Design a protein around this ligand. Structure first.
Ligand SMILES: [Ca+2]
Ligand code: NA
Lengths: 281, 63
């Protein structure tokens, strides 16, 4: 039997599924450590590796990209978990090696690949404390080209009144996602700052792991793919909506939680986002 | 103890020694400063960010 992880329910993805919308024909690049394409609860449609010493994007030697992918798009069947957008076309864009790290140029090359390959959504469950002009140009280029770009806010927690959101989440063009638990409490590790946009479940998140496994991970890395997956659901229901409109739909329909410095606009609600008229619940 | 700001500017060797006194089960990974990394949170992990001289360039923290 399949299980629906709590975070998929918490963002109201089942409401879209029951309307008949599951992310069909929407192209989502998981820009990450690869995706284990042999996993029976994943279907990987394509991809590319920008890691010089790891040229197969369908081999995930870290486990992180596989877990992130399962939250976006684990298949709807009788096994494992259910993803937010279980019919999405999932692309493994490998820019991190086994050790979970990548050079800025590898990330940028993956973002370029995604633009050149007409991806509708990019998820980057990744980040660094500093930006670069070339990194900012890549994400801004993707957005100018119509791509919804989602990234983890970071796991830096609080630091007085300072922002701790990392890059690329910190760039205005990227939706920066922080982590809550099943009670909608911000996770203590979740980065904070005026650049925090929305929140999604990022504590004890069950998903696919390499070698046909499943496990519960924690991080803004886990929160981000709830939002990338929600963007794919919204695009499957409204295939002509621009990235601008998908992003505003998600922002304008959150369930507000606390102060926006800690919670941004609150928890995403993809049911409300995918209606024509948007308000917060 | 989950952050080590006093280790910034120390050698990577001293930083590993000090962190393992405070957190003997720590899984330490050394990476060049200015790389991009996965954003999962691992309570057992302490990443070290080093400059080109192999000195600590950013505050180590658990995660
Ligand atoms: Ca399944
Ligand atoms: Na942003």
């Amino acid at each position: 039997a399949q299980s629906v992880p709590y975070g998929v329910s918490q963002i109201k993805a089942p409401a879209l599924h029951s309307q008949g919308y599951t992310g069909s024909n929407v192209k989502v690049a998981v820009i990450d450590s690869g995706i284990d394409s042999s996993h029976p609860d994943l279907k990987v449609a394509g991809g590319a590796s920008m890691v010089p010493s790891e040229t197969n994007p369908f081999q995930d030697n870290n486990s992180h990209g596989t877990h992130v992918a399962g939250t976006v798009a684990a298949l709807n069947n009788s096994i494992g978990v259910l993803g937010v957008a279980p019919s999405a076309s999932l692309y493994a864009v490998k820019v991190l090696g086994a050790d979970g790290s990548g050079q800025y140029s590898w990330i940028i090359n993956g973002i370029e690949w995604a633009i050149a390959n007409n991806m509708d959504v990019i998820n980057m469950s990744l980040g660094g404390p500093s930006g670069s002009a070339a990194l900012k140009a890549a994400v801004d280029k993707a957005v100018a080209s119509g791509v919804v770009v989602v990234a983890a806010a970071g796991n830096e927690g609080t630091s007085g009144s300072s922002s701790t959101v990392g890059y690329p989440g910190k760039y205005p063009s990227v939706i920066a996602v922080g982590a809550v638990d099943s009670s909608n409490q911000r996770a203590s590790f979740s980065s904070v700052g005026p650049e925090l946009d929305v929140m999604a479940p990022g504590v004890s998140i069950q998903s696919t792991l390499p070698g046909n496994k499943y496990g519960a991970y924690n991080g803004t890395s886990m929160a981000s793919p709830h939002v990338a997956g929600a963007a794919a659901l919204i695009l499957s229901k409204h295939p002509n909506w621009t990235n601008t409109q998908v992003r505003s739909s998600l922002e304008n329909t959150t369930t507000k939680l606390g102060d926006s410095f800690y919670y941004g606009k609150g928890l995403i609600n993809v049911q409300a986002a995918a209606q024509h008229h948007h308000h917060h619940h | 103890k989950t952050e080590w700001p006093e280790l910034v500017g120390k050698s990577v060797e001293e930083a590993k020694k000090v962190i393992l006194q405070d957190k003997p089960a720590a899984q330490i990974i050394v990476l060049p400063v200015g790389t991009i990394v996965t954003m999962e949170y691992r309570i057992d992990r302490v990443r070290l960010a080093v400059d080109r001289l192999d000195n600590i360039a950013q505050v180590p923290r658990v995660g």
